[PDB]
Amino acid sequence: DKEWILQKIYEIMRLLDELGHAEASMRVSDLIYEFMKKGDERLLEEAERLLEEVE
Amino acid sequence: NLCPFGEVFNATRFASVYAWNRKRISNCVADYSVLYNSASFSTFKCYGVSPTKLNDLCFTNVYADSFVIRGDEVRQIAPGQTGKIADYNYKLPDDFTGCVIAWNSNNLDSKVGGNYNYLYRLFRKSNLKPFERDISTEIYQAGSTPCNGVEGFNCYFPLQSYGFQPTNGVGYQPYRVVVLSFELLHAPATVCG
């Protein structure tokens, strides 16, 4: 089930690149790195919030 | 016969951090005072040596590793550090001897709409060894299923671009980084001040 989080965060930063918002994408990329080192799932919520602010 | 620092610091194009470029400096006079007193660098941190004594030392070889990273990642180009660069792109050893020099290149490496030419590695099976360069493009398997060369659910191309835009905040602006590794293991010494 953990794997679904990685896929969703990944999709968010890929989407942000396509919207022309590189800074937001780079901010989310950092969540991918941290996620894959931890059991902290709140990183998904943060990535989702960043996307909502951008859109 | 001065060392080709101009070819390192004033290069038209820098390498991606995942594939850092190593220039060998040898059989020359390294006028380090040119770099230290240029006042064009934001970072000039030396390990195992003070920058003000470089002019008085000889080295066996000097290797200049050049690449581009973002501002907030500059602190990872140091001994003892961790992070996506320190772990997957460019690792410096705990006993590193050398100088890390970096400067803002927002007026060179940034483009309107974003410069996506520079790449970093986000996914890898394990951490890099010191001064290891991994330029494989094999798709990373994050999940339980085999990828077999196909991207998809939990299978990713390991590299991700840095979208460097002129309007990015400072931590997201590009920085050109040159790491001068000093081989101070005694030998005939081909690089002198």
Ligand SMILES: *[C@@H]1O[C@H](CO[C@@H]2O[C@@H](C)[C@@H](O)[C@@H](O)[C@@H]2O)[C@@H](O[C@@H]2O[C@H](CO)[C@@H](O)[C@H](O)[C@H]2NC(C)=O)[C@H](O)[C@H]1NC(C)=O
């Ligand atoms: C890297 O290049 C800078 C700038 O070089 C100048 O501008 C270039 C476009 C080209 O026209 C060069 O021939 C010019 O010299 C160097 O900075 C200059 O260094 C000289 C010598 O110390 C000094 O007199 C100038 O005032 C400096 N100019 C500026 C704007 O700082 C820099 O030294 C070069 N770095 C290395 C390692 O060679």
